[PDB]
Design an enzyme around this catalytic site. Structure first.
Site, PDB file in Angstrom:
ATOM      1  N   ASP A 102       0.828  -1.209   0.000  1.00  0.00           N
ATOM      2  CA  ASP A 102       0.000   0.000   0.000  1.00  0.00           C
ATOM      3  C   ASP A 102       0.856   1.250   0.000  1.00  0.00           C
ATOM      4  OD1 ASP A 102      -2.852   1.176   0.433  1.00  0.00           O
ATOM      5  OD2 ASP A 102      -1.599   2.128   1.970  1.00  0.00           O
TER       6      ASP A 102
ATOM      7  N   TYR B 282       3.160  10.116   0.787  1.00  0.00           N
ATOM      8  CA  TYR B 282       4.106   9.550   1.746  1.00  0.00           C
ATOM      9  C   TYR B 282       5.562   9.883   1.418  1.00  0.00           C
ATOM     10  CZ  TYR B 282       0.101   6.369   2.803  1.00  0.00           C
ATOM     11  OH  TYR B 282      -1.118   5.794   3.101  1.00  0.00           O
TER      12      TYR B 282
ATOM     13  N   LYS C 175      -2.543   6.058  -4.182  1.00  0.00           N
ATOM     14  CA  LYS C 175      -3.614   6.985  -3.864  1.00  0.00           C
ATOM     15  C   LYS C 175      -3.337   8.359  -4.454  1.00  0.00           C
ATOM     16  CE  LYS C 175      -3.734   4.595   0.597  1.00  0.00           C
ATOM     17  NZ  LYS C 175      -2.282   4.501   0.817  1.00  0.00           N
TER      18      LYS C 175
ATOM     19  N   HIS D  85      -7.492   9.444  -2.160  1.00  0.00           N
ATOM     20  CA  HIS D  85      -6.979   9.289  -0.789  1.00  0.00           C
ATOM     21  C   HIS D  85      -7.926   9.799   0.285  1.00  0.00           C
ATOM     22  CE1 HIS D  85      -2.751   9.077   1.286  1.00  0.00           C
ATOM     23  NE2 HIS D  85      -3.683   8.814   2.205  1.00  0.00           N
TER      24      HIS D  85
HETATM   25  N1  LIG Z   1      -5.946   5.846   3.412  1.00  0.00           N
HETATM   26  C1  LIG Z   1      -5.381   6.614   4.310  1.00  0.00           C
HETATM   27  O1  LIG Z   1      -5.805   7.704   4.668  1.00  0.00           O
HETATM   28  C2  LIG Z   1      -4.524   5.806   5.284  1.00  0.00           C
HETATM   29  C3  LIG Z   1      -4.474   6.217   6.649  1.00  0.00           C
HETATM   30  C4  LIG Z   1      -3.688   5.454   7.534  1.00  0.00           C
HETATM   31  C5  LIG Z   1      -2.991   4.339   7.112  1.00  0.00           C
HETATM   32  N2  LIG Z   1      -3.088   4.004   5.740  1.00  0.00           N
HETATM   33  C6  LIG Z   1      -2.243   2.819   5.278  1.00  0.00           C
HETATM   34  O2  LIG Z   1      -2.353   1.882   6.368  1.00  0.00           O
HETATM   35  C7  LIG Z   1      -1.041   1.491   6.855  1.00  0.00           C
HETATM   36  C8  LIG Z   1      -1.094   0.961   8.279  1.00  0.00           C
HETATM   37  O3  LIG Z   1      -1.499   2.057   9.153  1.00  0.00           O
HETATM   38  P1  LIG Z   1      -0.498   2.881  10.065  1.00  0.00           P
HETATM   39  O4  LIG Z   1       0.853   2.967   9.395  1.00  0.00           O
HETATM   40  O5  LIG Z   1      -1.223   4.141  10.376  1.00  0.00           O
HETATM   41  O6  LIG Z   1      -0.317   2.035  11.424  1.00  0.00           O
HETATM   42  P2  LIG Z   1      -0.312   0.482  11.872  1.00  0.00           P
HETATM   43  O7  LIG Z   1      -0.016  -0.432  10.774  1.00  0.00           O
HETATM   44  O8  LIG Z   1      -1.529   0.329  12.716  1.00  0.00           O
HETATM   45  O9  LIG Z   1       0.909   0.544  12.912  1.00  0.00           O
HETATM   46  C9  LIG Z   1       2.211   0.707  12.405  1.00  0.00           C
HETATM   47  C10 LIG Z   1       3.085   0.873  13.696  1.00  0.00           C
HETATM   48  O10 LIG Z   1       3.082  -0.439  14.333  1.00  0.00           O
HETATM   49  C11 LIG Z   1       4.362  -0.949  14.548  1.00  0.00           C
HETATM   50  N3  LIG Z   1       4.343  -2.367  14.382  1.00  0.00           N
HETATM   51  C12 LIG Z   1       4.122  -3.138  13.272  1.00  0.00           C
HETATM   52  N4  LIG Z   1       4.109  -4.413  13.482  1.00  0.00           N
HETATM   53  C13 LIG Z   1       4.345  -4.506  14.850  1.00  0.00           C
HETATM   54  C14 LIG Z   1       4.419  -5.696  15.580  1.00  0.00           C
HETATM   55  N5  LIG Z   1       4.289  -6.935  15.096  1.00  0.00           N
HETATM   56  N6  LIG Z   1       4.665  -5.471  16.918  1.00  0.00           N
HETATM   57  C15 LIG Z   1       4.794  -4.186  17.404  1.00  0.00           C
HETATM   58  N7  LIG Z   1       4.712  -3.013  16.700  1.00  0.00           N
HETATM   59  C16 LIG Z   1       4.481  -3.250  15.372  1.00  0.00           C
HETATM   60  C17 LIG Z   1       5.202  -0.279  13.465  1.00  0.00           C
HETATM   61  O11 LIG Z   1       6.554  -0.175  13.916  1.00  0.00           O
HETATM   62  P3  LIG Z   1       7.862  -0.371  12.931  1.00  0.00           P
HETATM   63  O12 LIG Z   1       7.572   0.120  11.559  1.00  0.00           O
HETATM   64  O13 LIG Z   1       8.866   0.472  13.740  1.00  0.00           O
HETATM   65  O14 LIG Z   1       8.185  -1.889  13.028  1.00  0.00           O
HETATM   66  C18 LIG Z   1       4.576   1.160  13.356  1.00  0.00           C
HETATM   67  O15 LIG Z   1       5.063   2.006  14.400  1.00  0.00           O
HETATM   68  C19 LIG Z   1      -0.191   2.767   6.556  1.00  0.00           C
HETATM   69  O16 LIG Z   1       1.200   2.641   6.621  1.00  0.00           O
HETATM   70  C20 LIG Z   1      -0.767   3.168   5.186  1.00  0.00           C
HETATM   71  O17 LIG Z   1      -0.163   2.292   4.237  1.00  0.00           O
HETATM   72  C21 LIG Z   1      -3.829   4.692   4.817  1.00  0.00           C
HETATM   73  O1  LIG Z   2       0.982  12.487   6.783  1.00  0.00           O
HETATM   74  C1  LIG Z   2       0.276  13.521   6.308  1.00  0.00           C
HETATM   75  O2  LIG Z   2       0.905  14.567   6.054  1.00  0.00           O
HETATM   76  C2  LIG Z   2      -1.198  13.453   6.085  1.00  0.00           C
HETATM   77  N1  LIG Z   2      -1.980  12.296   6.520  1.00  0.00           N
HETATM   78  C3  LIG Z   2      -1.971  12.056   7.844  1.00  0.00           C
HETATM   79  O3  LIG Z   2      -2.079  12.832   8.797  1.00  0.00           O
HETATM   80  C4  LIG Z   2      -1.995  10.581   8.148  1.00  0.00           C
HETATM   81  C5  LIG Z   2      -1.930   9.952   6.921  1.00  0.00           C
HETATM   82  C6  LIG Z   2      -1.879   8.571   6.851  1.00  0.00           C
HETATM   83  C7  LIG Z   2      -1.839   7.740   5.602  1.00  0.00           C
HETATM   84  O4  LIG Z   2      -2.398   8.396   4.579  1.00  0.00           O
HETATM   85  O5  LIG Z   2      -1.414   6.627   5.417  1.00  0.00           O
HETATM   86  C8  LIG Z   2      -1.898   8.005   8.104  1.00  0.00           C
HETATM   87  C9  LIG Z   2      -1.982   8.538   9.359  1.00  0.00           C
HETATM   88  C10 LIG Z   2      -1.996   7.706  10.494  1.00  0.00           C
HETATM   89  C11 LIG Z   2      -2.072   8.379  11.709  1.00  0.00           C
HETATM   90  C12 LIG Z   2      -2.117   9.783  11.769  1.00  0.00           C
HETATM   91  C13 LIG Z   2      -2.090  10.568  10.615  1.00  0.00           C
HETATM   92  C14 LIG Z   2      -2.024   9.946   9.384  1.00  0.00           C
HETATM   93  S1  LIG Z   2      -1.911  11.092   5.565  1.00  0.00           S
HETATM   94  O6  LIG Z   2      -3.190  11.037   4.870  1.00  0.00           O
HETATM   95  O7  LIG Z   2      -0.680  10.985   4.812  1.00  0.00           O
END
Ligand SMILES: NC(=O)c1ccc[n+]([C@@H]2O[C@H](COP(=O)([O-])OP(=O)(O)OC[C@H]3O[C@@H](n4cnc5c(N)ncnc54)[C@H](OP(=O)(O)O)[C@@H]3O)[C@@H](O)[C@H]2O)c1
Ligand SMILES: O=C(O)CN1C(=O)c2c(c(C(=O)O)cc3ccccc23)S1(=O)=O
Ligand SMILES: O=C(O)CN1C(=O)c2c(c(C(=O)O)cc3ccccc23)S1(=O)=O
Ligand SMILES: O=C(O)CN1C(=O)c2c(c(C(=O)O)cc3ccccc23)S1(=O)=O
Length: 315
Positions: free
Chosen positions: A43, A48, A77, A110
Site C-alpha cells: 500500500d 508519503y 492513492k 486518498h
Molecule cells: N488511506 C489513508 O488515509 C490511510 C491512513 C492510515 C494508514 N493508511 C495505510 O495503512 C497502513 C497501516 O497504518 P499505520 O501505518 O497508520 O499504522 P499500523 O499499521 O496500525 O501501525 C504501524 C506501527 O506499528 C508498529 N508495528 C508493526 N508491526 C508490529 C508488531 N508486530 N509489533 C509491534 N509493533 C508493530 C510499526 O513499527 P515499525 O515500523 O517500527 O516496526 C509502526 O510504528 C499505513 O502505513 C498506510 O499504508 C492509509
Molecule cells: O501524513 C500527512 O501529512 C497526512 N496524513 C496524515 O495525517 C496521516 C496519513 C496517513 C496515511 O495516509 O497513510 C496516516 C496517518 C496515520 C495516523 C495519523 C495521521 C495519518 S496522511 O493522509 O498521509
C-alpha cells in the site's frame, strides 16, 4: 483463501504492507523483505514521499525473478491537491514513474476532500485553514474512470469516504466503474460496523488501515489508548500462542476485510505475515468488537471545516 475477489474481477491479497511513515532509507529494505517472506500487496501513496524507494524494491525483486508482476498487487492513492480533472492522470503517472510500474492494480482517491493545487500538500490560508478545491468528487471519479480506460490502473477506489459519500459515487449519473475498495481506519477501538456492512452490501471491499492503532503517529501518547498493550487483547493472543499484533491483523481478515499493517522492522514484517495458521473464535471476534470506543487516530483534524470532511457523519 489469501485473496478476495473485487467487483472488477481481480483477486486482491487480504494482507498487504503499509508504507505511511516508512522512512525512505528504510522502506526499500522493508519492501524487499516483505516480498521475500510472502507479501504480494503493497500500500503506497504519493503523499508519503517514499514511492521512489518503494519502487526500487519492487523493481529489484521483479529483476531477481522473486516475483512476477502479475502476482503483485500494488496500490497507490491520489492526493487531495490533484482532484482537478486535468491533474489526475499526471499524478497517476508520477506515482507509476516512481514505483517503476506500467500499471497499478488499484488507485484510490486518498480523501474525499479536494485541496487547492500547488506545491504544498496542505495549502493554508493566512489563518491556517486548508484551502479547498471547487472540483466535486463526481468529477474526480470520472477522471479516475479514464485511468482504467487508458490502461494505467486495473481498479479504482476510494478512501476515508463516509456512507453518504460512497452513496454519492454509486448514484453518480453515468457511473462507468463502481469503486472496488473503500480503505478506512478499522481496529477494535474503531470497529466501523455500520460503514463496513454498507460497503460490503454494495460489493465494495473494505481495507482496514491502522489495524494496530498507528503507534508511530506523530504525538502518540503512552496514556492514549494502546491496542498493542491492551491486556484483554494480550490475553486472546496468549490463548492462541500468537502475538497481540497477529491477533490484531487476523481480526479484520475474519470480517472479510483486507488489512495493511505497516512495519519497517524485518522481524515484525515477518511476524505480521504469520496470520494464516490460526482462527479466532466467534466469541473472540465478538469480544474484540466490543472494545469499540469510536477512537480515531487519523481524523484529518486540520480539515474539519472542509465541505467534504468525512467524519461529521456518524458513519
Ligand atoms: N488511506 C489513508 O488515509 C490511510 C491512513 C492510515 C494508514 N493508511 C495505510 O495503512 C497502513 C497501516 O497504518 P499505520 O501505518 O497508520 O499504522 P499500523 O499499521 O496500525 O501501525 C504501524 C506501527 O506499528 C508498529 N508495528 C508493526 N508491526 C508490529 C508488531 N508486530 N509489533 C509491534 N509493533 C508493530 C510499526 O513499527 P515499525 O515500523 O517500527 O516496526 C509502526 O510504528 C499505513 O502505513 C498506510 O499504508 C492509509
Ligand atoms: O501524513 C500527512 O501529512 C497526512 N496524513 C496524515 O495525517 C496521516 C496519513 C496517513 C496515511 O495516509 O497513510 C496516516 C496517518 C496515520 C495516523 C495519523 C495521521 C495519518 S496522511 O493522509 O498521509
Ligand atoms: O493473473 C495473472 O496475472 C496470472 N496469474 C494468475 O492468474 C494466477 C497466478 C498465480 C501465481 O503466479 O501464483 C496463482 C493463481 C491462482 C489462482 C488463480 C490464478 C492464479 S499468475 O501466474 O500470477
Ligand atoms: O499470492 C501468492 O502468494 C500466490 N497467488 C497468486 O499469485 C495469485 C493467487 C490467486 C488466488 O489464490 O486466488 C489469484 C491470483 C490472481 C491473479 C494473479 C495472481 C494470483 S495466489 O495463489 O494467492
Amino acid at each position: 483463501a489469501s485473496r478476495i475477489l473485487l467487483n472488477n474481477g481481480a483477486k486482491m491479497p487480504i494482507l498487504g504492507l503499509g508504507t505511511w511513515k516508512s522512512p525512505p532509507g528504510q522502506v526499500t529494505e522493508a519492501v524487499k523483505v516483505a516480498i521475500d517472506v510472502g507479501y504480494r500487496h503493497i500500500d503506497c501513496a504519493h503523499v508519503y514521499q517514499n514511492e521512489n524507494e518503494v519502487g526500487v524494491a519492487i523493481q529489484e525483486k521483479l529483476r531477481e525473478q522473486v516475483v512476477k508482476r502479475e502476482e503483485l498487487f500494488i496500490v497507490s492513492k491520489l492526493w487531495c491537491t490533484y482532484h482537478e480533472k486535468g491533474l489526475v492522470k499526471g499524478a497517476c503517472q508520477k506515482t507509476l514513474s516512481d514505483l517503476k510500474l506500467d500499471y497499478l492494480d488499484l488507485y484510490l482517491i486518498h480523501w474525499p476532500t479536494g485541496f487547492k493545487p500547488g506545491k504544498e500538500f496542505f495549502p493554508l490560508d493566512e489563518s491556517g485553514n486548508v484551502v479547498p478545491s471547487d472540483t466535486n468528487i463526481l468529477d474526480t471519479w470520472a477522471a479516475m474512470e479514464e485511468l482504467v480506460d487508458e490502461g494505467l490502473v486495473k481498479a479504482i477506489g476510494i478512501s476515508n469516504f463516509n456512507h453518504l459519500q460512497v452513496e454519492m459515487i454509486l448514484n453518480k449519473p453515468g457511473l462507468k466503474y463502481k469503486p472496488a475498495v473503500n480503505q478506512i481506519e478499522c481496529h477494535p477501538y474503531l470497529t466501523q460496523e455500520k460503514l463496513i456492512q454498507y460497503c460490503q452490501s454494495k460489493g465494495i471491499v473494505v481495507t482496514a488501515y491502522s489495524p494496530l492503532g498507528s503507534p508511530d503517529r506523530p504525538w502518540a501518547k503512552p496514556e492514549d489508548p494502546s491496542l498493542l498493550e491492551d491486556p484483554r487483547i494480550k490475553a486472546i493472543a496468549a490463548k492462541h500462542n500468537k502475538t497481540t499484533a497477529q491477533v490484531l491483523i487476523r481480526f479484520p481478515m475474519q470480517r472479510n476485510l483486507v488489512v495493511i499493517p505497516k512495519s519497517v522492522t524485518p522481524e515484525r514484517i515477518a511476524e505480521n505475515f504469520k496470520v494464516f495458521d490460526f482462527e479466532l473464535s466467534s466469541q473472540d471476534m465478538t469480544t474484540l468488537l466490543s472494545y469499540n470506543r469510536n477512537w480515531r487516530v487519523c481524523a484529518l483534524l486540520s480539515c474539519t471545516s472542509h465541505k467534504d470532511y468525512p467524519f461529521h457523519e456518524e458513519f
